[PDB]
Design a protein around this ligand. Structure first.
Ligand SMILES: NC(=O)c1ccc[n+]([C@@H]2O[C@H](COP(=O)([O-])OP(=O)(O)OC[C@H]3O[C@@H](n4cnc5c(N)ncnc54)[C@H](O)[C@@H]3O)[C@@H](O)[C@H]2O)c1
Ligand SMILES: NC(=O)c1ccc[n+]([C@@H]2O[C@H](COP(=O)([O-])OP(=O)(O)OC[C@H]3O[C@@H](n4cnc5c(N)ncnc54)[C@H](O)[C@@H]3O)[C@@H](O)[C@H]2O)c1
Ligand SMILES: NC(=O)c1ccc[n+]([C@@H]2O[C@H](COP(=O)([O-])OP(=O)(O)OC[C@H]3O[C@@H](n4cnc5c(N)ncnc54)[C@H](O)[C@@H]3O)[C@@H](O)[C@H]2O)c1
Ligand SMILES: NC(=O)c1ccc[n+]([C@@H]2O[C@H](COP(=O)([O-])OP(=O)(O)OC[C@H]3O[C@@H](n4cnc5c(N)ncnc54)[C@H](O)[C@@H]3O)[C@@H](O)[C@H]2O)c1
Ligand SMILES: Nc1nccc2c1ncn2C[C@@H](O)[C@@H](O)C(=O)O
Ligand SMILES: Nc1nccc2c1ncn2C[C@@H](O)[C@@H](O)C(=O)O
Ligand SMILES: Nc1nccc2c1ncn2C[C@@H](O)[C@@H](O)C(=O)O
Ligand SMILES: Nc1nccc2c1ncn2C[C@@H](O)[C@@H](O)C(=O)O
Lengths: 430, 430, 430, 430
């Protein structure tokens, strides 16, 4: 039918491959998955349509799914998140990948539709990040719905949307919540953003974090990671939250907690980690100090009112890709990053490989569960068993040279748990 | 029958009362419980037998239960944890309290038995910390078992024991797991020990934390708090763990993770936050650097092998209460704290009031739930609803001057949650 | 003439001795000074009159000076700073020590005067902390001025006063600035207070630091240490400064920097590390939140206006020694600590031994320099040579197990410095 | 004579100018210098030959010197440190700048020689960073030596070389040590590297810092900044030092301190902040874990033995500019960054603007002192007066919204210092 793939420049493949080479050495989980299942090919017969930012780490994921006997067609879930040299390597590798940095809402949709049909039939598996693929099939291609063995969501918002779908009886295929595995959530969301947020901010503005007032909206795992990152550089972080528990945590950590209505007049850097709309409005923009850097890191771009900036600023000047400086009627400048989209993936290279290995290992595990043990997952959204969760963490201990302790028969008996058996109750929050 | 109470010295009452006065101003949760239920007296008709360290904060708890119409008889759950001036105030207040610092395993048991019978009948409610009261009634006073409306456990180990009791069909009265409320666990266990661990170590040895190698066993909430406390002072913290996930977290936080077999040769300060036996054995003691300070903060005193010290040391010299310096055949000295018992409560005054207010508020809520809505809790161990969990955090926001944000109808709609309604799924780990 | 000594209770000697025993094992610098000079007795013929807080560490110092052949008579430089068991050990050891906790401005002066005359003549050496002894001799006993070989000051304020005395031609004996050795200043003032500030606050109030607003006046070495200590527990530290450089440093570290006029309305804990008067006035007290804990850690008690509290509070109630709760007309309570005096030494046991070893080693070195090489120090205030400064740090490396690197002849040549020779220019600030 | 300038591409001017625009708003010190001296033109008649990395911040510096009436000709002091868009803006602005990224040791020297001669005569002023310009004139163009009014050095090594030159009677023109101003040293070297080190490492490798063992050579201001940056992301930092004082500081901060001989077997990331040769040798390389990232941040590229890598590695593969992966006979890979040159400036954009404003303001002040008050600086190397040092910090307080406190006449009197007058003795180390 359509082309075999389409990227920005396939001349980037060589370089993309070196990156993939270094990347692999940083993601033990994925490589271990390869080590164990390359022969068995547990994913044989699977036609996985994936919609997840096309980065170097997503490239190692794709190739791991393939090494396991799967058949995939990829696409990014963000028009800015793609890493073109990574996409090139994948494309040149024979994998039909349809993504490139800077697509248009139009081309974006074209790419997703490109992954729906395989050589010997339509997709029978979904690996989503954001729920775009699953929402597309569900609302536009209902016919394919019954041929999909399972879904694999990894984003807080997406998984949130899934639970909602079920709550309304809209979900029609078994889904697995991968975001809520301890190794994914407590490490990706938190440790990931702690490292990739300032990377985006810096590569984009090269601003000095130290001595600045950074306002972080939301103290969830992402906000926790961002608040920590900024704090460590010498910034005075102010937090805004709607949850009294998350609010108390910020307070116990020495962060002042106020409303954006108040904080906007103080902040020097604004970071939205909220999962919802209307976090930074024009009423706030009008208060901001000159040259205030505004950016969003929550999965979607609905948190900052960019339209307002565009329709109220005296003038807008692009400094470079994904970096705009608006001049407001008050004579104050505002530096918007990545047009209100994910700053780490849009102005930088996303989370580091090591941490992505945790999430993606969880991803590969979900793909094998749903595909290999279907009758184990009725229509609804499930979690990965704790044993697999701990296995995922275990796989990365070696690289870090961590030496785990082994319970003695006596201890295991005293604690009333197995030497290896899950070490924590299902309600444990780590 | 027996005496009305028994403490170390009732002459301490005056001072204990001033402490309670200042304490109250630090525990908004308890005071708010008083504010709302003093009139209704939801605990009227309840005869609560409590077994929880008798400290200033436990004093404010006792008086809060009483202000709610309850009838109580207290006792500490530790022979060293009691704060005598606090006990005096309670005793002098007409509350039959039977506890004092430095009891003997014999007197310890006598005190618990003293709380079992009230003026108009035996205890019909349990407020335990460690499971000693609930295990006593269950195995020694089974007759009273059917008159108890419910249990209230707050310790990780105790709640662990409860879940075990049910698993074996031994639990005969509905129990509520208070330790696992987010406001209890993530704040008491973690933030509490972060503050009270060094307090105990310092008051006992006055040692300098900076530049020392502190070895922390277990990276759970307690270990997390201790590791952070020690790190913040300039100590090099090494962690030991059996859980791969908790191990990875330590690693992601920059803590070296090894086995005690290896760390014992390096440590300058040892802290066991494990919930199990045989953490520090003689084989380790023999390796320790001269004057190594050893102490335990995990609920029980089974983690450090003190017997070994006692039966192998060339000689033992007490420096002062709860501080002993053993001389080993190798010519190395070892400073044991609180005889291997909880260091923060035995060498210091336990956790600060503000944080105890969180747990105790949870405690008061469980007492009212079990007492007031019995048919809501069949025999087994339950959790407090999230709504109550968030209410507990909310109650402490004011004192800290935190300004919570309120979702707009639009946002509440977008997120698909209530403006007030619980803001997180039951699986949320914060 | 007068008594041989006078302390609070000589029955404390035994216990004081065990503390001294443990202390010695923590002060390698002093012990090494003992190791090398016990035989030579470089201080033989010296009659050192000392005025320095009489604590366990000052006890090890005293005994070290004696092991070096010196003759001493001690006294504390604070009426609250004395550690009675430590004084008892020294007194019982035959050393005429005249100090005890809780003296009166009257007894304080009597004690200092007690150290001026020795068996075979008046004092011929001064070891001061605060300048009280040197100012006493200079203004009250000028006759003894010409028999004193040298002065040894260790406090920022005292050394400040010395430089002033010289600037006005009032100093009549060679003094050595010991505070300004790198090993004293950057370690004692900073790391010391980082550890002993919260100790004092906690032992006194047992308040929870986390989630509180702590206001620190002055960002010098002491303020730096305090700000860091409070920050590490979860407090939101606000800083006040008069120096633009020290102010910028605070900002670069993420601390908001405002005026006390503004901060008083926000603070929950106030710490004055300033070296001057009128830091916290009544105008501030009237603004403070209820139960605000106020304390001072700067050498003198002139920073907090305690008189005002005493003359304007509706009522004052002592909670226990060195802890008072004033009720203000506005209905707000204010918890004053140590009556506005050094909180770490007055409500706790001062700085830990390890760090005091650094200062005291510097102290012993100055005593030997001034005594042994007099013609090397004309009347004026001098510094210890860098070689001795590095020697002091070196002496503590072993205990911490630090492995120092040794320049190769090639490297030493490239850098143009000696393998051992001082490694930094005199202007180096570390 | 020669061309008017030479850069990589003048088409970059537009973009470089937008960067300069944003940069200006981040460097208050330079802008304030402009505000005050633009009219007076204190640098009129000056022909400043500058040799300092040609970055956006150096661009704002150049334009500030020009706004003050100076005449300049620039060149970078590093063949990789140049920021081409910044150079283009300067070149297109009419300023003869001769620098571009990726020059050859040959072109490097050509550029410096290009700045020596101006329209109306040779250079009469030097603004150096590294001592290359001053060492060139001194050893190659001695004739011009007597026409230069003064030197301005800002690098630790350069200033080190200057002191050496004087010590040997080689220095023939008054020099000013700008690196050793408190506002330069404690902020640039320390806070600068804290922010720009990981930027270079990340942009180059995109490696995850968390959970890695980072080995930092040298604990001076740079090492302090690097150690702190790495620590804050979750890395376990090990320190190596030759100075016992700097070593004790690292220890007191919780960093293990060992020899490179030992640490090389453990490190995952190596950073040399030393100011000398032979820090990382082949004997170390042969021990490093696979894919160990090695980089240098100390001013020169003599710290890592790159020649060895080049002459002993089985094979070398370039991943991209300034990023090479060597394969060692042992089968271990080694990732070298920026060919052993400054990693922050070579793989990233150097220090942020705000902090560079501090150094550069000091630089402008030195240019005016040497030029304007010549007879104030005889041949030798001097420091800027404290008043100017504090002025520099003061100038950046506003942007950060810091509210400095003002001593009262009473306080100023008590402290014995002026309300504005320098607030610290010359030996103060901050
Ligand atoms: N760009 C990335 O690399 C990346 C990585 C992980 C997650 N995410 C996205 O970031 C978002 C946050 O994820 P998370 O795991 O931290 O979610 P989370 O649920 O843990 O936390 C979000 C927090 O926002 C708070 N909040 C909600 N509305 C708010 C408002 N109006 N004002 C202030 N606070 C508010 C909530 O109380 C909650 O604690 C999600 O959309 C997720 O998909 C992005
Ligand atoms: N003294 C106090 O103030 C106080 C306050 C709260 C809890 N506690 C007690 O401390 C203990 C720990 O509580 P928690 O909430 O942190 O529990 P937790 O379950 O969160 O963590 C305990 C950790 O220990 C690790 N562990 C178990 N056996 C180990 C071993 N042999 N070696 C190394 N690590 C091992 C586990 O993997 C786990 O992560 C409990 O007994 C609890 O009752 C004391
Ligand atoms: N109790 C102890 O254990 C202990 C230990 C060391 C020093 N000290 C004492 O603490 C004091 C401070 O010592 P240091 O070494 O940190 O001194 P320092 O000179 O380094 O710092 C004091 C700081 O106070 C700032 N300051 C001055 N007046 C101020 C005002 N009105 N408002 C705000 N800030 C102001 C100054 O700019 C300076 O940076 C001295 O009196 C010293 O003797 C006490
Ligand atoms: N790239 C940049 O942005 C940047 C910024 C400032 C300074 N620098 C450069 O970095 C270097 C360090 O500057 P600094 O201000 O921190 O110098 P510094 O003098 O403060 O510290 C260097 C430290 O190295 C230690 N050291 C010396 N030889 C050693 C060895 N063989 N092993 C271990 N430690 C050793 C010294 O004891 C000293 O403490 C200088 O060359 C300087 O020009 C670079
Ligand atoms: N390097 C990377 N590759 C792929 C995806 C990446 C990424 N960095 C961040 N995300 C975003 C996700 O981590 C986020 O949406 C999630 O929820 O896991
Ligand atoms: N001040 C205090 N009063 C009462 C109890 C106190 C305490 N500090 C610590 N615990 C121990 C509990 O926090 C612990 O066993 C728990 O699990 O909550
Ligand atoms: N344990 C202790 N012994 C003696 C003195 C002690 C002390 N702690 C603090 N100071 C105060 C000094 O550190 C301080 O005034 C100084 O300037 O050195
Ligand atoms: N953005 C930048 N512009 C110019 C120079 C820069 C720089 N970043 C670091 N250096 C290096 C200097 O900070 C260093 O060599 C010094 O000693 O000041």
């Amino acid at each position: 039918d359509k082309l075999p793939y389409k990227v920005a420049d396939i001349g980037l493949a060589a370089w993309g491959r070196k990156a993939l080479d270094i990347a692999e050495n940083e993601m033990p989980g994925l490589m271990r998955m390869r080590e164990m299942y390359s022969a068995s090919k547990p994913l044989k017969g699977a036609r996985i349509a994936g919609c997840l930012h096309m980065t170097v780490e997503t490239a190692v994921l794709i190739e791991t799914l393939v090494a396991l006997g799967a058949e995939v067609r990829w696409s990014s879930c963000n028009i800015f998140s793609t890493q073109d040299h990574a996409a090139a390597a994948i494309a040149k590798a024979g994998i039909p990948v349809f993504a490139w940095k800077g697509e248009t809402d139009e081309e974006y949709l074209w790419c997703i539709e490109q992954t729906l049909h395989f050589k010997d039939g339509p997709l029978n598996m979904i690996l989503d990040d954001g729920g775009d693929l699953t929402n597309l099939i569900h609302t536009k291609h209902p016919q394919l719905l019954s041929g999909i063995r399972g879904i694999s969501e990894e984003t807080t918002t997406g998984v949130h949307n899934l639970y909602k779908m079920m709550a309304n009886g809209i979900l029609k295929v078994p889904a697995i919540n991968v975001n809520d595995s301890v190794t994914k959530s407590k490490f990706d969301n938190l440790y990931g953003c702690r490292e990739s947020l300032i990377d985006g901010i810096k590569r984009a503005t090269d601003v000095m974090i130290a001595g600045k007032v950074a306002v972080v909206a939301g103290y969830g795992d992402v906000g926790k990671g961002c608040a920590q990152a900024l704090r460590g550089f010498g910034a005075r972080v102010i937090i805004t939250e709607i949850d009294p528990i998350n609010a108390l945590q910020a307070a116990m950590e020495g962060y002042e907690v106020t409303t954006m209505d108040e904080a906007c007049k103080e902040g020097n850097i604004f970071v939205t980690t909220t999962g919802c709309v209307d976090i930074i409005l024009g009423r706030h923009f009008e208060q901001m100090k000159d040259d205030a850097i505004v950016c969003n890191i929550g999965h979607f771009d609905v948190e900052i009112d960019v339209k307002w900036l565009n329709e109220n600023a005296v003038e807008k000047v692009n400094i470079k890709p994904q970096v705009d400086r608006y001049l407001l009627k008050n004579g104050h400048r505002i530096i918007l990053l990545a047009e209100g989209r994910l700053v780490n993936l849009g102005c930088a290279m996303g989370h580091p490989s090591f941490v992505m290995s945790n999430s993606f290992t969880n991803q590969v595990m979900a793909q094998i569960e749903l595909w290999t043990h279907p009758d184990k997952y009725p229509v609804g959204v499930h979690f990965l068993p704790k044993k697999l969760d701990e296995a995922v963490a275990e796989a990365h201990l070696g690289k870090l040279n961590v030496k785990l302790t082994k319970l003695t028969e006596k201890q295991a008996q005293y604690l009333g748990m197995p030497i290896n058996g899950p070490f924590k109750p299902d309600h444990y929050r780590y």
